[PDB]
Design a protein around this ligand. Structure first.
Ligand SMILES: N[C@@H](CCC(=O)N[C@@H](CS)C(=O)NCC(=O)O)C(=O)O
Ligand SMILES: N[C@@H](CCC(=O)N[C@@H](CS)C(=O)NCC(=O)O)C(=O)O
Lengths: 208, 208
């Protein structure tokens, strides 16, 4: 199983943690985006959208971190604990994964990307959207130890990648008591957390 | 099965078309966002994120259109044709669903939302991102009749909702030959297309 990635990338880190939780060995292949390695003809043949993470599993090329997370559990999971067979349980996890992409991580990207990639002035209005996203996550987590069911699922792992990216960006996570509680527990129980944090500290370099 | 929605909403229309394809009757409940009906305590108890579409199915409250699409197929589909059992086939569909949210529809939102909701001047740079997204979709569709497998799947239905929203926004879809071919076929084969187009024409009012 080939894994094209960079350690700093949040979506790459979600896959690293998921693969570790599942117990599937990844052949880790650094793909240097700063060098344009993703844009070379050889990579475009694998992933024409030229994004990381990209997985190649026995001829099957797959991208989108959250699709990769689910695929790894479905194909390699000894049990379905991280992504249960029940359509209802799956739907909650799926909703949280779409929340993670389209609301939570989207708020990260909308606010921090223009600053770190375009060197633009921070938009205090986009910051309000981050706060809104955390407020929703906080409400989801009321009375709940995990984000999308009774135990750890791919939804938690995805959110851990995102929230840890916010931590290294110096966002005040502690203001959201349920998020903070969930997050601190998640660090202790999520396989691959240390490698994720190494990646977060790598990404921090964009804030220097 | 209760369905809180507005006909103009792209994510609502994906669910309408999916429910029709599956053959599941929806109790359609208009939720007037302009009135703030989604923000009332009674709705927040169902969906604390106050978004449409929201489904309530026998006590189970679910939001995120793409999660709802999959759930309807998993629970109600007579066959799994729209969302096959195979993890590999599912993964391709899942990747296309994340593409639809985070790349294609995101480009719509980034460009048109500030104009139609904030009355801001169009950003020609955000327009370039729409073109980029369509270029990726065009490449995905090379030699393919459907977006994510040999037959129509929830991925096509999601993309139909999005691309039809671009059509009513007057985006030049015909410039992307594979997208145009796929889209025109999709109109003919996708259950609920006419109701989707009615909704698109409703949304057009935001461009008056
Ligand atoms: N929605 C995608 C996002 C992928 C993504 O943001 N990858 C970035 C690096 S973190 C990338 O490959 N950028 C290079 C490019 O798009 O050309 C996912 O979750 O995997
Ligand atoms: N990612 C969500 C998007 C939901 C969405 O954009 N809904 C809008 C209307 S089209 C909404 O409920 N806005 C009201 C709000 O967020 O307060 C999905 O696919 O369902």
């Amino acid at each position: 199983v080939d894994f094209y990635y960079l350690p700093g990338s949040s979506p790459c880190r979600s896959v690293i943690m998921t693969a570790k939780a599942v117990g599937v060995e990844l052949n880790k292949k650094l793909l240097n985006l700063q060098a344009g390695e993703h844009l070379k003809p050889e990579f475009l043949k694998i992933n024409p959208q030229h994004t990381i993470p990209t997985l190649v599993d026995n001829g099957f090329a797959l991208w989108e971190s959250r699709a990769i997370q689910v695929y790894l559990v479905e194909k390699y999971g000894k049990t379905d604990s991280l992504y249960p067979k029940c359509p209802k349980k799956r739907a909650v996890i799926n909703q949280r994964l779409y929340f993670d992409m389209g609301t939570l991580y989207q708020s990260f990207a909308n606010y921090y990307y223009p600053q770190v990639f375009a060197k633009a002035p921070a938009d205090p209005e986009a910051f309000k959207k981050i706060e809104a996203a955390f407020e929703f996550l906080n409400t989801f987590l009321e009375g709940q130890d995990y984000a999308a069911g009774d135990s750890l699922t791919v939804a938690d792992i995805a959110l851990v990648a995102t929230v840890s990216t916010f931590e290294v960006a110096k966002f005040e996570i502690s203001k959201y008591a349920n998020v903070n509680r969930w997050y601190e527990n998640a660090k202790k129980v999520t396989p691959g957390w240390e490698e994720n944090w190494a990646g977060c500290l790598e990404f921090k370099k964009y804030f220097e």
